[PDB]
Design an enzyme around this catalytic site. Structure first.
Site, PDB file in Angstrom:
ATOM      1  N   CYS A 143       0.790  -1.225   0.000  1.00  0.00           N
ATOM      2  CA  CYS A 143       0.000   0.000   0.000  1.00  0.00           C
ATOM      3  C   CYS A 143       0.826   1.281   0.000  1.00  0.00           C
ATOM      4  CB  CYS A 143      -0.932  -0.003   1.210  1.00  0.00           C
ATOM      5  SG  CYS A 143      -1.664  -1.623   1.545  1.00  0.00           S
ATOM      6  N   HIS A 182      -9.215   2.299  -2.614  1.00  0.00           N
ATOM      7  CA  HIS A 182      -7.790   2.039  -2.393  1.00  0.00           C
ATOM      8  C   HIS A 182      -7.207   1.130  -3.484  1.00  0.00           C
ATOM      9  CE1 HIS A 182      -4.016   1.427  -0.424  1.00  0.00           C
ATOM     10  NE2 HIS A 182      -4.309   0.284   0.180  1.00  0.00           N
ATOM     11  N   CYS A 196      -0.034   3.275   5.840  1.00  0.00           N
ATOM     12  CA  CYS A 196       0.267   1.922   6.308  1.00  0.00           C
ATOM     13  C   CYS A 196       0.311   0.988   5.128  1.00  0.00           C
ATOM     14  CB  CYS A 196      -0.772   1.427   7.327  1.00  0.00           C
ATOM     15  SG  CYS A 196      -2.464   1.344   6.753  1.00  0.00           S
TER      16      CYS A 196
END
Ligand SMILES: [K+]
Ligand SMILES: [K+]
Ligand SMILES: [K+]
Ligand SMILES: [K+]
Lengths: 385, 385, 385, 385
Positions: D90, D343, D371
């Site tokens: 990510c 995302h 994160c």
């Protein structure tokens, strides 16, 4: 016509290959073709005389359109030939012969071929149509899915055999004793030339396959040490159960009049055929019901049968059948059977009938009985000529 | 027994669903179960009376072990019921009925059910067993592979129909006129209640499916504008060809004595059945050969037939058949057919026979003829009572 | 900090396994883990001192989330360790080392590991998301798809090498002469113990893999007889091209201050690193451009380099590079290279740098240059300490 | 050079599409291409000036060789451009920007682009190489396998977030309140033109996609009624978790001298970047560790930051971060974030940095913290000019 007008004039089979071994990548249609060519040659029947065919095959997935038709045309029969495939699971190859007999007795055709075939080595995996689900999905093995898993109980045929064995006190030791006897009978028959008449060889790319592959794949000392194959406290093992295999068997059938017309020698005649069924999990006891049914149809008693072919799906099945009906074990599966030779599902019903056609002495009577997934059994009685 | 001792006492079918639509994700075994329950109710025959079943199904891959047995047990028949599946491609549902008739005529059973079924929506994709080759491989569609691609010519059945059409000067315009007539005849029959007797509804996840889905999926103005579907210079299109579909059709059959025994009303009796075949690419001309064969078996002539069901695999096929035999178009496929209703391969041969059972007027004779992949055709003649 | 403050304190690698052989079914993360453990032991650096990692890997499909992180934690590093994977195709393992060097020179970390890894044996096949198209679809091999097929030209990297060879008159005979020399140099180096310092063994279930597998898989007499591997009139063959392989290589890097702090022995220091690129089909000529670039960055000339590692993607590439730049062949790839040792894509850039770290004599300078799919090349110069 | 010499001169992004919706079947390389063209136009930098690129992408399986190179060449950059892909899960799109900044600060390049991209809609399924085992095997979804399932705990990232939530008493109700706030803030920002500067539209087959798709896919009344999405007694739901999405974001970076050389207007300058990590299951608390690290690197305190972008992997993460560090919620994610915008894993770290580049007022400082799967977090601080 009486049923006894139906005569067998030829019979042949491929060797039975072991799983992914001798006939790996050989489509079921090749096996069928070669067995059918062999049977026609055995009968001295030119392929152009064949009017109709019934061929058993249970899991023909990805073998292409009309694998039975492919076999018949591949063997040189005329495009005018009528062809049908049948699926009665393990009884398919016998039921095909019965269907052929019916239209002969009704004089709807004169020259018919029938048999069964399976290539378990070539059975594919399945992916369902449509959206592959988020998170993935299982590639399904066609062998358990369409061949050997019972749908109603969602357990394998061997687990069903465990249930029947426990119910009727057919012990591990009895099953292993029978399995060893089958392996030894298969080897003895091969040594004695018993299969020479019925076997036709295949060339595979090149080697010649001319002998059943399975019956040498055994270690007698290890048999009593094997773990149960299907259930934790089971009695059925890989050794005392039939195996996954490839093969085809065919017969040529006509009427007494057709045989006279073409100058053919009748090898055997039909006395009776039929089927019985019970609860799916109890397919193992269904041969014990079909046998009295076809005896009655033939007007015979158990003592009138010289040889029994009770398909060895598992050692459990001939053991149950013999003890429940009071059969003489020395007259049952005397040249081995599917525990040691293997069980190409669609083939076996045809193999055991063709074996009787060749191995009975003239005048002797043979009875074949074959349990099938779903709870059924096929039965057939013939008289050697 | 004479063949005329064989009687139909009930017939029913599901609606035909369109591809991946009304019966999307509904297994073939559910469709067969509901058609069989319906046929038994139509016959006023309790399921426990059924002794044997023959069910046609062409591509049952991934439907589990013995889908024909699943149907029979699902419908409430006893586990003692004998069950066999048959595959004669597009003729399967008719050949199943013929096999049932043969064993009734031989008095081997008294009460038998037969039919055909297909879920083309649930046909899976295939991956072969063994090493996926370096560079990848094709996931195979079971529909063309096992259902609709001719193996010998390696072209689709529609491309075979293009060949027959060009050879015999059956034009695009003639095929389209026939297609439009089929769609109009299907719609009119639905409106007039013609199918009310034979149809049984299904609940699907929760909607009720009670009507054939395909015959509304048409635009008459667009039909002459469609591009050829199978070959670049072809005449066959999506509109004038049969479609991919889901459905099942079943009949209940007994003897005249069986019907008397159980207090049943015979609906129709068998006059003749049989099959013919020619070169695989020429399956479209095979009905024109089987029809004279079954007429001869029945001792009849073309003029003796009141209604013809010549399965509409493609508009080419009834057009060829009518002009070759001199049939009156006003007596052919008068309530539509597979061009507008669809062609679940295993179902159609049973559908068209069950349709004659219900729609013939008492005293009328009907002939059904259905071409099949591989070059064959099945034929059947019945008389309404 | 100057670039010369960046020091290598350890280097290690797995043997290179041949395709689907020594490391068949061994995930790339296991190979990486063992190489990283080995490098840390070589450096006498406890895993808890590592602050950051960069690891090259090109086709990690189905190796799970964050295979670089898996390697670092698997090797015993603290969860506080920062981890990144890089993909610059064949240059990945070098670019990872460059990225590590950059953050050391900027004093963003003090103790960093870097390297590259690939398991080509474990690369999966792909099926796209969504509706599987009617008629089926191709299962895609990840090796050509994401590893070795040029996207823009839609030809394999070897076909690109054929183009470059033809353009620059690098003959089949020259390529085979070079390939034979590589195979002989690899065998000689192994015999002489040249790889003993850099190699760490792996246990695979159990056998111990401790030697490069590929370089024995050769028949010198057959090399001039092989058919072209990529294009009909090509010069590139399986023998004079790199192969599909499995392996991992890692280094441990710090600053001169970090080495003093932890009592470590610097093995080598960085003099320059960088990259160049040209047209995708011409990746084979990109090393000849990156080399002058990194020489200029280091303030060096060709004569200042004692050993060259010009990755042997194909014999074409070192041949072009040597002749175009005027390099002494006796100082190029002197212990073999990817034509004979193999080319696990993400590994090779790290392997050749780690090899120089161990095999240079103190004071000597080594230059590594590695072409990559897409048209790029990485370059790096180090000084042995 | 000091870090403050590194300047952003352009930033752009695609809208974020929802899973299998606006950008269904649009490869990641197309999204990246359009974001990069947009960023270069925003910067007034002709593509031929770009010397090097770093692009984040986490699961590029089946996107072909070197998708980052495909993006760069697709955008019109010269084949001389150096290209690398990075995967830090990510954090990939942020780490790419950091790597670009490092080489600028070292004066190894002058003009560099960086960003991140993901097409989760185009992530394929996997089948392993080699023998499909008897009995079948699973087709693996690349999204959980390589993107979102934690390998060490073998639970999804959402289940990890459940664990962090329970440990620190971050309730379902608090997560839902935060989620609703995010959806409302996204909608308000869209209405107020906040995203007009950074967004570039795409034409898809033909519709124009010009707005984030996800933030309208919500029902506020249903949010408190949803069942836990990851664990039976969990607090994380589909609404208060990020979603699966498609998009790309890019920036154009140079030095103060480069900007002067080319007549460009610096938009923002770099103050600090870095990373921290902890136990994989605890990735949700890693931003609270990286933030003090990058503040220290910049010589700043919490009070010095005007806007925070703390990636909304789950509502848990900004909630934990805010309460642990004492952040003012009115300065955190003020224009929404990944809970409501989605995302696309590789994109988000670049999106949130590019958003600060455009939305900060001159003189303001922004901190981005993201994160990542595996236990890490990336951090970055920039100052608007
Ligand atoms: K056995
Ligand atoms: K149609
Ligand atoms: K080689
Ligand atoms: K959400």
């Amino acid at each position: 016509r009486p049923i006894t007008d139906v005569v067998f004039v030829g019979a042949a089979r491929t060797p039975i290959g072991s799983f992914r071994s001798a006939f790996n990548n050989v489509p079921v249609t090749v096996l069928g073709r070669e067995a059918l060519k062999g049977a026609l040659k055995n009968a001295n029947v030119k392929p152009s005389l064949v009017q109709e065919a019934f061929i058993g095959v249970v899991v023909p997935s990805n073998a292409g359109q009309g694998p039975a038709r492919q076999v018949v045309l591949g063997a040189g029969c005329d495009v005018s030939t009528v062809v049908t495939a049948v699926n009665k699971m393990c009884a398919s190859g016998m039921k095909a012969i019965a269907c052929a007999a019916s239209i002969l007795q009704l004089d709807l055709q004169e020259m018919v071929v029938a048999g069964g075939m399976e290539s378990m080595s070539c059975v594919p995996f399945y992916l369902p149509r449509g959206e592959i689900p988020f998170g993935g999905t299982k590639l399904i093995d066609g062998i358990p899915r369409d061949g050997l898993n019972d749908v109603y109980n969602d357990i394998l045929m061997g687990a069903c055999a465990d249930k029947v064995a426990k119910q009727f006190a057919i012990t591990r030791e009895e099953q292993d004793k029978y399995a060893i006897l089958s392996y030894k009978r298969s080897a003895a028959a091969w040594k004695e030339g018993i299969f020479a008449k019925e076997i036709i060889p295949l060339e595979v790319t090149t080697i010649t396959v001319e002998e059943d592959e399975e019956y040498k794949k055994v270690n007698f000392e290890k048999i009593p040490k094997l773990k149960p194959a299907f259930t934790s406290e089971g009695s059925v093992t890989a050794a005392n159960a039939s195996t996954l295999n490839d093969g085809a068997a065919m017969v040529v059938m006509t009427t007494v009049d057709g045989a006279k017309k073409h100058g053919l020698k009748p090898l055997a005649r039909m006395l009776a055929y039929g089927d019985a069924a019970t609860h799916p999990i109890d397919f193992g006891i269904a041969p014990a019901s079909v046998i009295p049914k076809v005896l009655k149809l033939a007007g015979l008693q158990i003592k009138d049968i010289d040889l029994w072919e009770i398909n060895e799906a598992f050692a459990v099945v001939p053991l149950y059948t013999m003890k429940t009906l009071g059969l003489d074990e020395s007259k049952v599966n005397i040249h081995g059977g599917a525990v040691s030779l293997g069980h190409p599902i669609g083939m076996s019903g045809a193999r055991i009938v063709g074996h009787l056609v060749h191995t009975l002495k003239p005048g002797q009577k043979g009875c074949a009985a074959i349990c099938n997934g779903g709870g059924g059994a096929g039965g057939m009685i013939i008289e050697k000529l």
